[PDB]
Coordinates of C-alpha atoms (C1' of nucleotides) and ligand atoms in Angstrom, one line a residue:
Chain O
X6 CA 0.0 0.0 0.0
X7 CA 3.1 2.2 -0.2
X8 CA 2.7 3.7 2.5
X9 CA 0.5 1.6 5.5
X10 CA -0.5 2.5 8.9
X11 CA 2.2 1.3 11.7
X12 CA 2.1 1.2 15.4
X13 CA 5.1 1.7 17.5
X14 CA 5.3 -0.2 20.8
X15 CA 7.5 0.2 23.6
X16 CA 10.4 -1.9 24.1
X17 CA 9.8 -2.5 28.5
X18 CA 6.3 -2.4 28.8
X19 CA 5.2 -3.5 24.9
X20 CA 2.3 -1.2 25.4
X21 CA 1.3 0.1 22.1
X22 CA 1.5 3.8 21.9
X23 CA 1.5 5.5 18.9
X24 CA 0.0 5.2 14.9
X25 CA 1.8 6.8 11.8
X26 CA 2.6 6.2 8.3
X27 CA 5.7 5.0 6.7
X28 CA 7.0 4.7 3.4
X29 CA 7.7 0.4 2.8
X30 CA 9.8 0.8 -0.1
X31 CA 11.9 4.1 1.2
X32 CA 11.9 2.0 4.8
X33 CA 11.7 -1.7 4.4
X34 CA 12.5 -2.1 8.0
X35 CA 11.2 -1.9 11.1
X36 CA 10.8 1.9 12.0
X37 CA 13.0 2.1 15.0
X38 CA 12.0 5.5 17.1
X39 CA 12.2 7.1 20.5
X40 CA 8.9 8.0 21.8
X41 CA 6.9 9.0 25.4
X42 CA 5.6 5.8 27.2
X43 CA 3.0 6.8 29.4
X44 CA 3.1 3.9 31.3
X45 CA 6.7 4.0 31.9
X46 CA 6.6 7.5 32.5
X47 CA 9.8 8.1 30.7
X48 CA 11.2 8.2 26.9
X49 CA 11.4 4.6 25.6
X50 CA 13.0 3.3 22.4
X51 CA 9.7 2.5 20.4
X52 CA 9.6 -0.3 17.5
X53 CA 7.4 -0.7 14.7
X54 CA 4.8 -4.3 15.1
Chain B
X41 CA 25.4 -46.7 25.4
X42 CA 22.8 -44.6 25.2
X43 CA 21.7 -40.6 25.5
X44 CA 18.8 -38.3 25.5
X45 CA 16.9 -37.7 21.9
X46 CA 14.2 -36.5 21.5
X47 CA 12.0 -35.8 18.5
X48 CA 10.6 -32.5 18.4
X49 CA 6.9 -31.3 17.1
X50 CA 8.5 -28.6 14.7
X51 CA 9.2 -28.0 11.3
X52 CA 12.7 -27.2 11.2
X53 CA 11.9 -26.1 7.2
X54 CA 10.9 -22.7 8.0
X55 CA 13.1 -20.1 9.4
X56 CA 10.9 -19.2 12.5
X57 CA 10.2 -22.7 13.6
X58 CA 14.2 -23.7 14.8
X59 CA 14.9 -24.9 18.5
X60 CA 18.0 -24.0 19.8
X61 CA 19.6 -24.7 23.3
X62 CA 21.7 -23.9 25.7
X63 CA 21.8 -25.5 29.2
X64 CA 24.3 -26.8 32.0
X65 CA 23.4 -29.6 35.0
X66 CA 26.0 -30.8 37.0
X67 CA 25.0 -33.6 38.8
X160 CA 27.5 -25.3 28.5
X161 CA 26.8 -27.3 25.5
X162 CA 24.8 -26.3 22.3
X163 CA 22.0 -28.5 21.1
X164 CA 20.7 -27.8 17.0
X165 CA 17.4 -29.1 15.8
X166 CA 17.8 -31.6 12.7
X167 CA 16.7 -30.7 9.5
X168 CA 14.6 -33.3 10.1
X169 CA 12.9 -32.3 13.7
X170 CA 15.2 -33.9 16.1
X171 CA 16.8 -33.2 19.3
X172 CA 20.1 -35.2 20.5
X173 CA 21.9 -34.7 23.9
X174 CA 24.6 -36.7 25.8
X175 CA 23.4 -38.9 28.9
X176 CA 23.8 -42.4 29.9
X177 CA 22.3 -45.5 29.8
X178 CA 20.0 -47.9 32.6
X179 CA 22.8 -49.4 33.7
X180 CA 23.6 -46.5 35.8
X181 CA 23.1 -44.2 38.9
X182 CA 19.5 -43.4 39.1
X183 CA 19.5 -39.8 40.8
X184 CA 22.4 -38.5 39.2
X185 CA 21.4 -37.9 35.7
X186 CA 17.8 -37.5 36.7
X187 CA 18.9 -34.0 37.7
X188 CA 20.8 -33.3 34.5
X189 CA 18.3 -34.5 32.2
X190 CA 15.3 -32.5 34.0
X191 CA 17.2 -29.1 33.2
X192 CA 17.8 -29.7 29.9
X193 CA 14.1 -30.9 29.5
X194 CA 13.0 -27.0 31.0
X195 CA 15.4 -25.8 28.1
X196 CA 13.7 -27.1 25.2
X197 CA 10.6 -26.2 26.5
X198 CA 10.8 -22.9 27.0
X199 CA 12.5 -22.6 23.6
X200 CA 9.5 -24.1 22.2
X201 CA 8.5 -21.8 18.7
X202 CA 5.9 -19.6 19.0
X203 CA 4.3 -20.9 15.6
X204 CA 4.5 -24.5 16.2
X205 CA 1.0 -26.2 15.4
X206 CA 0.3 -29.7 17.5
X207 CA 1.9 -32.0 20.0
X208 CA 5.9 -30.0 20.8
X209 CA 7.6 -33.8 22.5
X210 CA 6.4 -36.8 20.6
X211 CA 9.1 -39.4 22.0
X212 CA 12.1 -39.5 24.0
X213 CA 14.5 -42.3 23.6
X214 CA 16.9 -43.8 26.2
X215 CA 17.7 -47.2 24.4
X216 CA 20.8 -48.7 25.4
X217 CA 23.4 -49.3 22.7
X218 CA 22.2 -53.2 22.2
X219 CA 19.2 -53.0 24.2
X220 CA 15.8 -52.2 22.2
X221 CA 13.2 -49.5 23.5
X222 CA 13.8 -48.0 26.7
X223 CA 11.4 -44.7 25.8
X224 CA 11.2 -42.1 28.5
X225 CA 7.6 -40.6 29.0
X226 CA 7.1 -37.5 27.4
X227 CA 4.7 -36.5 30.2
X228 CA 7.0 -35.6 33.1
X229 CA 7.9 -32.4 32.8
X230 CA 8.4 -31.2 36.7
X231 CA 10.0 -33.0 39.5
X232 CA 11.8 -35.7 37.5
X233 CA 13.9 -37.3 40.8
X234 CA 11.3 -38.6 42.6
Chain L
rG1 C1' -10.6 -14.0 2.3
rC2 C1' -9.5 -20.1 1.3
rC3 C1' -7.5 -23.8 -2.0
rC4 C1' -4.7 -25.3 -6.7
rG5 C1' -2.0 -24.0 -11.2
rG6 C1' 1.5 -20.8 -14.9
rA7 C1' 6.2 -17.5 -15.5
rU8 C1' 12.7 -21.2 -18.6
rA9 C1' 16.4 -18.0 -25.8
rG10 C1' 13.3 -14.1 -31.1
rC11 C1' 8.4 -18.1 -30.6
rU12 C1' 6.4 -22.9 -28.5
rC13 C1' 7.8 -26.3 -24.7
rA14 C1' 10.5 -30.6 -21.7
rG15 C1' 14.0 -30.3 -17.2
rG16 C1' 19.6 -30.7 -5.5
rG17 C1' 25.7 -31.6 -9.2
rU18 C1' 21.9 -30.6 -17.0
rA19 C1' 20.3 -25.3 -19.0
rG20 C1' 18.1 -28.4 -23.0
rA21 C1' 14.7 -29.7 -27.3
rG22 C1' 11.8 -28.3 -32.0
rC23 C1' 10.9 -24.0 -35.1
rA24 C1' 13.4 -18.9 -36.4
rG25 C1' 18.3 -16.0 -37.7
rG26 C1' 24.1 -16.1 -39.7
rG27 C1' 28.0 -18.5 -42.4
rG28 C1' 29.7 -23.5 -44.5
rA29 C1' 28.3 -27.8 -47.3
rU30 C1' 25.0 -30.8 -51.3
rU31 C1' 22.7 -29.0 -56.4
rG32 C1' 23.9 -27.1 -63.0
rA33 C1' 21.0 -23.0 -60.6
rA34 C1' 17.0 -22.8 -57.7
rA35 C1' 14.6 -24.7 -54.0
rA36 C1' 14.0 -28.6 -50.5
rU37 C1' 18.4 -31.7 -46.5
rC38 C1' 23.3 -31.9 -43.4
rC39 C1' 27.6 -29.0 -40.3
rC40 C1' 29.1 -25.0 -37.0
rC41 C1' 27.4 -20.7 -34.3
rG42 C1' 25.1 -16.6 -31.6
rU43 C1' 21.5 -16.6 -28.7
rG44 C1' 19.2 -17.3 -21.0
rU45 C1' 18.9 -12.1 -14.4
rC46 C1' 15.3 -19.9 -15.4
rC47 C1' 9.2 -13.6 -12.9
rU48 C1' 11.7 -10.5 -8.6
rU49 C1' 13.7 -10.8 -3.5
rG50 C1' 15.5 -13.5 0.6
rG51 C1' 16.7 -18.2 3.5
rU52 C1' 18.6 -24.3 4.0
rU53 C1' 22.7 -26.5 1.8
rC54 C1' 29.8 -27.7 -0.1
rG55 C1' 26.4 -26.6 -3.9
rA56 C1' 19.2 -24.4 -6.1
rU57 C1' 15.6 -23.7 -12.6
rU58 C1' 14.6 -27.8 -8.7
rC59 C1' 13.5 -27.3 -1.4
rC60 C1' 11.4 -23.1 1.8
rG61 C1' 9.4 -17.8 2.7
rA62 C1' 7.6 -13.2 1.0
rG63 C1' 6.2 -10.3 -3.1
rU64 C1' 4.4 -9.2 -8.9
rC65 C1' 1.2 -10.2 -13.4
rC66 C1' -2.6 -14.0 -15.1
rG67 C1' -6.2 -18.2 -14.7
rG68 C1' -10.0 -21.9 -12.2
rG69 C1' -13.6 -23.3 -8.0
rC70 C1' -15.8 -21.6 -3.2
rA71 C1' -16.8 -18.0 0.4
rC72 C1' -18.2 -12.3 1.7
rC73 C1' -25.2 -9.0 6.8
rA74 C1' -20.0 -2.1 9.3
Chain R
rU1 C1' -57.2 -73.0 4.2
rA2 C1' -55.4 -76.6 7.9
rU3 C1' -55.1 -73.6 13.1
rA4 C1' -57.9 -69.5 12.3
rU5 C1' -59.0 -64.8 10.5
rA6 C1' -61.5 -61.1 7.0
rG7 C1' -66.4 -61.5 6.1
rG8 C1' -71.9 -62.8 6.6
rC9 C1' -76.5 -63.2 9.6
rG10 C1' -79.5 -61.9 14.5
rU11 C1' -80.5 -58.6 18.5
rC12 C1' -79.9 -54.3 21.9
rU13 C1' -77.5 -49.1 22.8
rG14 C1' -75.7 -44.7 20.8
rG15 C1' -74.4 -41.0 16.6
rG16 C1' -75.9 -37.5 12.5
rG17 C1' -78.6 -31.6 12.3
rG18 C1' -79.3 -26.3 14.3
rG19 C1' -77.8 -21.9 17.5
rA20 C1' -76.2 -14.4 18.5
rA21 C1' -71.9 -13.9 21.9
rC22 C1' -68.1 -16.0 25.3
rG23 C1' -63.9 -20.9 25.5
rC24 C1' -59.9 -24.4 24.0
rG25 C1' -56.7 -26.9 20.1
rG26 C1' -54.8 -26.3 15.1
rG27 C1' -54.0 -23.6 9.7
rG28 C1' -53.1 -18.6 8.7
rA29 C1' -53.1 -13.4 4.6
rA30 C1' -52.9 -8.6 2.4
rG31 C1' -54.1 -3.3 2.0
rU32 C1' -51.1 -0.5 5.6
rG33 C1' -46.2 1.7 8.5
rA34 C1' -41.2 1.9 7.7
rA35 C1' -42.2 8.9 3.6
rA36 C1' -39.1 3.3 -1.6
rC37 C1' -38.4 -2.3 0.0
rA38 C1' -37.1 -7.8 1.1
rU39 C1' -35.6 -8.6 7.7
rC40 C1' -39.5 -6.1 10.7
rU41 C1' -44.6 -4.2 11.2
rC42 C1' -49.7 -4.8 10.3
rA43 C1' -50.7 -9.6 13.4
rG44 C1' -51.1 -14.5 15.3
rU45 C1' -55.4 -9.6 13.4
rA46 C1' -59.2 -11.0 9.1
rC47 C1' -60.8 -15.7 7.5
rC48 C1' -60.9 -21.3 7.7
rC49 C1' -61.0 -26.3 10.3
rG50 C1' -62.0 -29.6 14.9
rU51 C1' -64.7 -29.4 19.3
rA52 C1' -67.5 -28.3 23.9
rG53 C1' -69.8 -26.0 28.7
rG54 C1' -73.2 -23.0 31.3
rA55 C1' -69.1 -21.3 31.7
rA56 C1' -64.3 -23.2 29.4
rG57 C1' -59.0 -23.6 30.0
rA58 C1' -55.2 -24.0 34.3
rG59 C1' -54.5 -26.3 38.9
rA60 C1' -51.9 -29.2 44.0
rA61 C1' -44.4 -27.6 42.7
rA62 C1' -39.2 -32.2 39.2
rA63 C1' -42.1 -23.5 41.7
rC64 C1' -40.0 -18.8 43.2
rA65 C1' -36.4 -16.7 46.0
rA66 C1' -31.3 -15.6 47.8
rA67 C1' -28.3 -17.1 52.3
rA68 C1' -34.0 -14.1 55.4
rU69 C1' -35.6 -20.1 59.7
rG70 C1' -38.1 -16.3 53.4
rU71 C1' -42.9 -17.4 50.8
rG72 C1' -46.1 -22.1 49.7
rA73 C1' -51.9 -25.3 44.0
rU74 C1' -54.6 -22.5 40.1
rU75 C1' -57.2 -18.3 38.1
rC76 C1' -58.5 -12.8 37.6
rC77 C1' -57.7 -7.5 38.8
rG78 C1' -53.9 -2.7 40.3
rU79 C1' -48.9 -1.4 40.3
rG80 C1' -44.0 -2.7 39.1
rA81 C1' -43.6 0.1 33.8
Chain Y
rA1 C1' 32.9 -53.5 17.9
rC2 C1' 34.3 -58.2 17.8
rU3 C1' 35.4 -64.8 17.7
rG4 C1' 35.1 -70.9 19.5
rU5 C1' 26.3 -71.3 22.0
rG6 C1' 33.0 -71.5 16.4
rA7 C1' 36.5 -64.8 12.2
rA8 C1' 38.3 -64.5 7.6
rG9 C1' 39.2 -67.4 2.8
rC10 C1' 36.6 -70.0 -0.9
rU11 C1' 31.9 -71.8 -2.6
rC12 C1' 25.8 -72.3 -2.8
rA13 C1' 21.4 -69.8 -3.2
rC14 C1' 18.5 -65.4 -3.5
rA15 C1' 17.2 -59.6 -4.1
rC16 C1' 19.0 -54.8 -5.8
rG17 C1' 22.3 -53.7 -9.2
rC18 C1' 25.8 -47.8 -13.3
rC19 C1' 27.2 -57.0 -13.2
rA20 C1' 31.4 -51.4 -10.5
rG21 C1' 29.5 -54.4 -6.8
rU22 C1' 26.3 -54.4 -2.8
rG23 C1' 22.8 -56.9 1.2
rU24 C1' 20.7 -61.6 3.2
rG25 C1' 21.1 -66.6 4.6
rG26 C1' 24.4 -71.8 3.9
rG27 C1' 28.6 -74.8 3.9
rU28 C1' 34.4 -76.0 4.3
rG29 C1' 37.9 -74.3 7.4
rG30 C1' 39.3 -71.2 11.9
rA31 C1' 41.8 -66.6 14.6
rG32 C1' 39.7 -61.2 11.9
rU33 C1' 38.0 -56.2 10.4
rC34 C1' 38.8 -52.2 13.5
rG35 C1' 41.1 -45.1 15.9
rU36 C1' 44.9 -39.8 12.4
rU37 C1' 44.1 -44.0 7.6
rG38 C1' 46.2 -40.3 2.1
rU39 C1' 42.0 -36.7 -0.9
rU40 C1' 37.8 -34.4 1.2
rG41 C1' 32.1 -29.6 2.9
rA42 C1' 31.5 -34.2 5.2
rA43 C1' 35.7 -40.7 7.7
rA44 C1' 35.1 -44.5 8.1
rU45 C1' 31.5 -49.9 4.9
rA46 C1' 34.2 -50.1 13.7
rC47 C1' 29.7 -49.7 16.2
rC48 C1' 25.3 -47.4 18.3
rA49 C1' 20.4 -44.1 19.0
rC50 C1' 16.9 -41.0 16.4
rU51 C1' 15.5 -40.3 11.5
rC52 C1' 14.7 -38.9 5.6
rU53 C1' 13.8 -41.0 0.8
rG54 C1' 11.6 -45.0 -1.9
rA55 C1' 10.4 -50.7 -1.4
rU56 C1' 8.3 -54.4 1.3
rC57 C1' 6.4 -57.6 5.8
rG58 C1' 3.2 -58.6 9.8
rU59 C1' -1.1 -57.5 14.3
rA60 C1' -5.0 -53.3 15.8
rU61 C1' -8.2 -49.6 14.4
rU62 C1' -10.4 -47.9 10.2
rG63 C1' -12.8 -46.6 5.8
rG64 C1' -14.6 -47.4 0.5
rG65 C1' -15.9 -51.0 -4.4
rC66 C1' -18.4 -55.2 -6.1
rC67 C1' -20.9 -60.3 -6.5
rU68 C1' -24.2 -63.2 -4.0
rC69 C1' -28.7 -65.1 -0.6
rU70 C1' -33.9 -64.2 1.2
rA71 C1' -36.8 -62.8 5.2
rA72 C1' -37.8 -56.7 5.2
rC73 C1' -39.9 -53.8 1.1
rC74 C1' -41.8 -53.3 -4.3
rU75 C1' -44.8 -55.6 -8.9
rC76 C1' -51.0 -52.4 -13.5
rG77 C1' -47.3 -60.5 -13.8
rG78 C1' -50.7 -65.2 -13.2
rA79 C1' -54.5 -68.1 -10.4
rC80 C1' -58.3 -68.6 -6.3
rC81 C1' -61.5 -66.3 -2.3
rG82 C1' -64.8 -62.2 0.1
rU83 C1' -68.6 -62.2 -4.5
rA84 C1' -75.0 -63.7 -6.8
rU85 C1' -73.3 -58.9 -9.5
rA86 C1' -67.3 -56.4 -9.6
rU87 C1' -61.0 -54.4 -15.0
rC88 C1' -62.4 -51.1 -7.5
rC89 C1' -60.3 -52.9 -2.7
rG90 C1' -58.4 -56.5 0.6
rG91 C1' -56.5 -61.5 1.7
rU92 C1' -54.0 -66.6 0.2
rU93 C1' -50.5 -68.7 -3.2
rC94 C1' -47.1 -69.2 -7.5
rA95 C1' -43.6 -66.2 -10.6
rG96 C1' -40.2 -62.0 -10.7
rG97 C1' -37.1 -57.9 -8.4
rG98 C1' -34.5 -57.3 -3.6
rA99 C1' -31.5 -54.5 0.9
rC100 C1' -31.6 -51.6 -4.5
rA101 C1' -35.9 -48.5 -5.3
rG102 C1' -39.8 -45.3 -2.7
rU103 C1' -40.6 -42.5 1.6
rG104 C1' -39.1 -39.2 6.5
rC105 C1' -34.9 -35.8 8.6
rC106 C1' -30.3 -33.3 7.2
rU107 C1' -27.5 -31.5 3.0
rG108 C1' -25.0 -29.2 -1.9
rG109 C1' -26.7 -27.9 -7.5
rU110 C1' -30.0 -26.3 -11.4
rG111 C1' -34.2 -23.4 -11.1
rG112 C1' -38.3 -16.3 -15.0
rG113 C1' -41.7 -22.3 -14.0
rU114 C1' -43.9 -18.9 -10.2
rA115 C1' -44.1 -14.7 -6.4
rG116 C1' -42.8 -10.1 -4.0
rU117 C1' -40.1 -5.6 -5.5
rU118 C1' -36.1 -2.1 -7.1
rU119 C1' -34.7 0.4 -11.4
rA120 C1' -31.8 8.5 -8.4
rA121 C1' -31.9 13.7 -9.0
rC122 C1' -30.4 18.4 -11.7
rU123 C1' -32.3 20.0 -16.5
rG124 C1' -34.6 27.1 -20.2
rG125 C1' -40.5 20.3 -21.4
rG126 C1' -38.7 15.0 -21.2
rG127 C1' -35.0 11.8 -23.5
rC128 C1' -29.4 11.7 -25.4
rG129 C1' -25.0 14.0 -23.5
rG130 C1' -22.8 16.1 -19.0
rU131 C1' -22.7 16.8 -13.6
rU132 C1' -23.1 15.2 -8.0
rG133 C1' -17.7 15.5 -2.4
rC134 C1' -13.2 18.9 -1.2
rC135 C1' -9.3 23.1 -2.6
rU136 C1' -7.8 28.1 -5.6
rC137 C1' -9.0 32.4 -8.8
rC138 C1' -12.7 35.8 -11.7
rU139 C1' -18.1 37.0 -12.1
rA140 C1' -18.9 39.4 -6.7
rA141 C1' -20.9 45.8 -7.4
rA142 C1' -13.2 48.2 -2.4
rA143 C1' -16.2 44.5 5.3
rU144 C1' -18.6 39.1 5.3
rG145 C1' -21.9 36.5 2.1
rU146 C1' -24.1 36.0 -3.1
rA147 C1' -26.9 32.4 -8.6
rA148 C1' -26.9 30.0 -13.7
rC149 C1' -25.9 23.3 -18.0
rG150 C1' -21.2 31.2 -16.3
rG151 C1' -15.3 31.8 -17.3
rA152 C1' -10.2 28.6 -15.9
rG153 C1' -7.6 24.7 -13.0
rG154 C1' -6.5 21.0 -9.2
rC155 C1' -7.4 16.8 -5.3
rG156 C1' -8.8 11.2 -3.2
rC157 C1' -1.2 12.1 -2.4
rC158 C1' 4.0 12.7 -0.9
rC159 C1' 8.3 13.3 3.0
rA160 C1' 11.9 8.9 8.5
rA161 C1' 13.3 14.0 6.1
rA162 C1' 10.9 17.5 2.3
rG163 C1' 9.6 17.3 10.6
rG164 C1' 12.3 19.9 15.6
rU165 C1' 16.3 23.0 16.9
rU166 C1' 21.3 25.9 16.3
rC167 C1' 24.5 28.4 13.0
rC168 C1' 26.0 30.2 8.1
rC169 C1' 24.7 32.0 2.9
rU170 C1' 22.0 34.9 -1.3
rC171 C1' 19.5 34.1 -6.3
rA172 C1' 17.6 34.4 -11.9
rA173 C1' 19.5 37.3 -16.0
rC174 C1' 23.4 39.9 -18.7
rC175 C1' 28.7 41.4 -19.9
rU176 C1' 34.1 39.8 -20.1
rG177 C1' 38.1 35.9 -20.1
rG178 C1' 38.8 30.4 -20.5
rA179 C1' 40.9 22.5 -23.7
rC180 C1' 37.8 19.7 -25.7
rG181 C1' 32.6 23.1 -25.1
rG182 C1' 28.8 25.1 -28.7
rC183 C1' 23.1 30.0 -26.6
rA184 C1' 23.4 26.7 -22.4
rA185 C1' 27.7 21.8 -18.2
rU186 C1' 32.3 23.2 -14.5
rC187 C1' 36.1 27.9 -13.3
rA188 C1' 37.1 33.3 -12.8
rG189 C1' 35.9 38.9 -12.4
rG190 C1' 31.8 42.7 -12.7
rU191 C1' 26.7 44.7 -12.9
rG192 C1' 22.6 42.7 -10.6
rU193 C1' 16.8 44.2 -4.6
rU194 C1' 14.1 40.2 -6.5
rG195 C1' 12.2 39.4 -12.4
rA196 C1' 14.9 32.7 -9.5
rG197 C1' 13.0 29.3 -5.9
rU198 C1' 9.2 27.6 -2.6
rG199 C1' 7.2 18.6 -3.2
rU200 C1' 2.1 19.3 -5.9
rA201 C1' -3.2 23.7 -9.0
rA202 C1' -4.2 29.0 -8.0
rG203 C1' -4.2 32.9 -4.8
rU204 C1' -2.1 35.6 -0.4
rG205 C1' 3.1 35.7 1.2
rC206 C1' 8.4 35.0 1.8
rA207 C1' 15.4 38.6 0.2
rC208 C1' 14.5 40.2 7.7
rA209 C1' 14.0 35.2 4.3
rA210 C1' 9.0 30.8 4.7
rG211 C1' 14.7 30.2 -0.6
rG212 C1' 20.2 27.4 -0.4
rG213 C1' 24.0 24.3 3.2
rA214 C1' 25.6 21.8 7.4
rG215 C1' 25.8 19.4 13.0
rC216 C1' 22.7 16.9 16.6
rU217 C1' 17.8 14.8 16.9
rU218 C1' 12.1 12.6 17.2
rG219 C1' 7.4 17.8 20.2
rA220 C1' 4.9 13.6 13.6
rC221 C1' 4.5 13.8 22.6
rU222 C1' 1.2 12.5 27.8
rG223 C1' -2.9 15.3 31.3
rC224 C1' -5.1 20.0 30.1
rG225 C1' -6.6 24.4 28.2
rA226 C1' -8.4 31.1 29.6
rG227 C1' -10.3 33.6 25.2
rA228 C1' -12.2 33.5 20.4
rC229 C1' -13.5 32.7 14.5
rG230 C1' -17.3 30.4 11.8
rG231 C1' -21.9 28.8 12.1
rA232 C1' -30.1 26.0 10.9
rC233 C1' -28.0 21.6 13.3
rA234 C1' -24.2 17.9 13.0
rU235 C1' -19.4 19.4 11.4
rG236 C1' -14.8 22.8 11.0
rU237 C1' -10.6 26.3 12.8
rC238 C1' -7.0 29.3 16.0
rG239 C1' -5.0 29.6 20.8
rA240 C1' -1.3 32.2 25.2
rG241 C1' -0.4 29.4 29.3
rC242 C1' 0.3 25.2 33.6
rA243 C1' 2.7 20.2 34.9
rG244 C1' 5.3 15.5 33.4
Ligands
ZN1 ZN1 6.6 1.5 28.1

RNA sequence: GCCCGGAUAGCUCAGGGUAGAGCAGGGGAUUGAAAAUCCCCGUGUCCUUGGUUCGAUUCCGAGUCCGGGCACCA
RNA sequence: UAUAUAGGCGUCUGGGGGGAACGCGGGGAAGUGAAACAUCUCAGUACCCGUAGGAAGAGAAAACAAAAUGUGAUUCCGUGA
RNA sequence: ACUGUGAAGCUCACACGCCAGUGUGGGUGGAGUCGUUGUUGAAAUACCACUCUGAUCGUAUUGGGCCUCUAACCUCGGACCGUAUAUCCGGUUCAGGGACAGUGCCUGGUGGGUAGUUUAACUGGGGCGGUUGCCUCCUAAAAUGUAACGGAGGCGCCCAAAGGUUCCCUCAACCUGGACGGCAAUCAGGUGUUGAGUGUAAGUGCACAAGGGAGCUUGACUGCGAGACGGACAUGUCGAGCAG
């Protein structure tokens, strides 16, 4: 779909946070991302699902 | 003599679905699924101590389990063999899983 | 959405240590010329990515373009 | 056709049909509403069939209830709403 | 790992076999192959356990395909009886089919044979054609708003940097001099205040830069939000500031 609707999860907690769009033939990986966790409380590396 | 293989639910085809181990009993060696879906280890034989292995073979058990793959479909242990080297059948249960020495 | 099948030279199509066959095209040969036939060539990311393996066209995964049957009460 | 049976004679006792409404058991529409229509509604209504009684049906827990030593067959009214 | 509950070596048979040799059993005789063997990705055909690919044996469970037999069931085949009258009906018996067919419940297919209905609006009458939502300009009469099948276009995306921040810079065009090189590539000097550029239409803006370049980075956050714009309603839009 070019570009398809992601969720980022935290690393600790694997509570899924956030929702964007990303680009799968400019970024064939897993977006890789530093985000808020509220349930942390603190700034978490984030990865794509 | 004889050892500890067992013949793991898995299809070792597909990238996901590979078992590997890791685990030391004394009572660090590496254990690598077949390409065929089996499991080999180094143990002895019945014509042996009873409690001493029976400690060493439990951890090792507790490895492969939790190592199991998250995709595997139906039964994960199907048969565990501890035939002699001359001596014919000698199958462990597959059901004990906690508490071996007793 | 589920299950099968197809992709291999210019064309058609067979194939875990093989890229091949029949038509096309180029030169040589036979013939008195001509045609019809025999010889030697050039032709290929084996749909595209990745994995197992000493080694893949062949096994596995994902993806692309087609085809067949079935399912689809925001 | 043998056991016998179907059947045939004789004699007693019943049945049949009608009725305005009410009752019980079955079969069962459409116009209409949804500002169209098929689920849905109309409506188990209209109509149809089988049956009674002075009334009928139901009725004496294989029931409710919720830790209270609570009610205690059925039917019909008012609330719950 | 082996041998006298008797190895090799030869010979007897069988099965596979690229008859290169393998594997199984038998006999004579009795004292063996086997570890680094030298190449090799892989070493022993020393042996063992699990197992793959085909091939074959057995016991257990388990499904399908047929042929038979008669007793269920079927016969608008025959003959008797009820029956004096009966091409109805029922019974008895012979002759045929026979667990099939028919029927009940469940289930897939075909199914205008039948039934209930749908088949949009705008519109210089209706049809044909075109259009239907969002964004920009003109008509639009110098606040806002304003119609017609009036005049022109665009959208149903893209960017992991083309977002955040800190710092630095100034284009396009023209003139002059330069190997290929020319109107135009890259270099150098001068004039040059916006005529270039801003992912993508148009408009309003931007040289103070919102345009060009680089370093780090994820605020393309969590809980909120005084006060407003616009509005039939449902929608839509801006926002200082407080804390993590
Ligand atoms: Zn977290």
């Amino acid at each position: 779909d070019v570009r398809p609707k992601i969720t980022l999860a935290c690393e600790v907690c694997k509570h899924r946070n956030y929702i964007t769009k990303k680009n799968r033939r400019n970024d064939p990986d897993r977006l890789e991302i530093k985000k808020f966790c509220p349930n942390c409380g603190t700034h978490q590396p984030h990865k794509e699902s | 003599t004889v050892e500890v293989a067992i013949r793991l639910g898995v299809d070792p085809r597909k990238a996901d679905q590979m078992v590997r181990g890791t685990v030391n009993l004394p009572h660090k060696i590496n254990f690598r699924v077949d390409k065929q879906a089996n499991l080999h280890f180094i143990i002895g034989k019945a014509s042996f101590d009873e409690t001493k292995l029976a400690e060493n073979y439990g951890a090792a058990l507790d490895e492969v389990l939790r190592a199991k793959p998250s995709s595997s479909k139906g039964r994960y242990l199907k048969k565990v063999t501890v035939s002699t080297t001359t001596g014919p059948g000698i199958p462990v249960d597959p059901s004990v899983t906690r508490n071996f020495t007793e």
